[PDB]
Ligand binder design. Structure first.
Ligand SMILES: *[C@@H]1O[C@H](CO)[C@@H](O[C@@H]2O[C@H](CO)[C@@H](O)[C@H](O)[C@H]2NC(C)=O)[C@H](O)[C@H]1NC(C)=O
Lengths: 36, 48
């Protein structure tokens, strides 16, 4: 079963500033005290 | 000039070598870039 709940107001794109996010550990290794 | 994209192989036992079929395996593995799970038949030893 599934149903199209198409009652949905056609709102514009909304926006926010992703200041400093989405950094992730680039590889599966350990490092410390270093600018890599 | 519109075609079904995909074909049979003509594999009769009368085929010549290289026109004959081969079964193929490819082994893919990454090395040392994580913890690991498949290893060669070697005995470990105590921590010194
Ligand atoms: C919900 O509504 C959409 C249309 O907004 C339905 O989409 C159609 O689905 C049929 C097959 O069921 C297609 O032949 C049409 O081409 C689709 N419409 C469009 C505009 O492409 C959808 O099937 C509906 N789903 C339910 C569960 O009611």
């Amino acid at each position: 079963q599934c149903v199209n709940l198409t009652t949905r107001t056609q709102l514009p794109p909304a926006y926010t500033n992703s200041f400093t996010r989405g950094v992730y550990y680039p590889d599966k290794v350990f490092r410390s005290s270093v600018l890599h | 000039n519109c075609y079904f994209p995909l074909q049979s192989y003509g594999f009769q036992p009368t085929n010549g070598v290289g026109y004959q079929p081969y079964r193929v395996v490819v082994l893919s593995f990454e090395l040392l870039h994580a913890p690991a799970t498949v290893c060669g038949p070697k005995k470990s030893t105590n921590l010194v």
